[PDB]
């Protein structure tokens, strides 16, 4: 599970 | 589980 | 579990 | 468990 | 458990 918020 | 908030 | 807040 | 707040 | 607050 990988989450990136940019 | 990887979370990055940028 | 890895969290980075930048 | 790794947390960095920057 | 590693916490850095910068």
Numbering used by the authors:
A (entry chain A), B (entry chain A), C (entry chain A), D (entry chain A), E (entry chain A): 1 to 6
Q: What text does the study give?
A:
Aggregation-prone-motifs (APRs) of proteins are short segments, which – as isolated peptides - form diverse amyloid-like crystals. We introduce two APRs - designed variants of the incretin mimetic Exendin-4 - that both display crystal-phase polymorphism. Crystallographic and spectroscopic analysis revealed that a single amino-acid substitution can greatly reduce topological variability: while LYIQWL can form both parallel and anti-parallel β-sheets, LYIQNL selects only the former. We found that a simple change in crystallization temperature or modest changes of chemical composition of the solvent system (therefore the available interaction partners) can prompt formation of significantly different nanostructures: we identified four different polymorphs of the LYIQWL and two of the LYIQNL APR peptides.
Needle-like crystals grew from 0.1 M acetate buffer, both in the presence and absence of ethanol at pH=4.8 and diffracted to a resolution of 1.70 Å and 1.55 Å, respectively. Crystals grown from both solvents contained β-strands of parallel orientation, but arranged in different amyloid topologies. In the monoclinic crystals grown from the ethanol containing solvent system, strands arranged in the class 3 topology could be observed, while the orthorhombic crystals grown in the absence of ethanol contained strands arranged according to the class 4 topology. Similarly to the class 3 structure, hydrophobic residues (Leu and Ile) form a hydrophobic niche in this arrangement too, while polar side chains of Asn and Gln stabilize the interface enforced by H-bonds. The side chain of Tyr2 forms H-bonds with chain termini. Due to the parallel orientation of the β-strands, Tyr ladders with a distance of 4.8 Å between adjacent side chains are formed in both crystal structures. Although the Tyr side chains also meet near the chain ends in this crystal form, the interplanar distance between them is 7.0 Å, indicating a much weaker, if any, type of interaction.
